[PDB]
């Protein structure tokens, strides 16, 4: 996919990370974790404690804008954040096989 970073804000107070960006694709609509994959390579951070907040598809073209979020410890987040934020974060992820990528 073609993602573009808009801004990179850091929220230490709530040990959170405010990073806004855009995601565009040719119909192909991935998922949260899926997007996290590339986003992980884009943000270059711990994918484990990485999730998305929300997104919005563009009508004009085939673009979609959204905002990502990152925490430090789920311990705090589990408390601070709400079931709403934790709601997004899917239960478990996939895993084709041990071997992957080039």
From Swiss-Prot:
<dbReference type="InterPro" id="IPR012677">
    <property type="entry name" value="Nucleotide-bd_a/b_plait_sf"/>
</dbReference>
<keyword id="KW-0689">Ribosomal protein</keyword>
<dbReference type="GO" id="GO:0005840">
    <property type="term" value="C:ribosome"/>
</dbReference>
<dbReference type="GO" id="GO:0006412">
    <property type="term" value="P:translation"/>
</dbReference>
<comment type="similarity">
    <text>Belongs to the eukaryotic ribosomal protein eS24 family.</text>
</comment>
<dbReference type="GO" id="GO:1990904">
    <property type="term" value="C:ribonucleoprotein complex"/>
</dbReference>
<dbReference type="Pfam" id="PF01282">
    <property type="entry name" value="Ribosomal_S24e"/>
</dbReference>
<keyword id="KW-0687">Ribonucleoprotein</keyword>
<dbReference type="InterPro" id="IPR001976">
    <property type="entry name" value="Ribosomal_eS24"/>
</dbReference>
<protein>
    <recommendedName>
        <fullName>Small ribosomal subunit protein eS24</fullName>
    </recommendedName>
</protein>
<dbReference type="InterPro" id="IPR012678">
    <property type="entry name" value="Ribosomal_uL23/eL15/eS24_sf"/>
</dbReference>
<dbReference type="GO" id="GO:0003735">
    <property type="term" value="F:structural constituent of ribosome"/>
</dbReference>
<dbReference type="InterPro" id="IPR018098">
    <property type="entry name" value="Ribosomal_eS24_CS"/>
</dbReference>
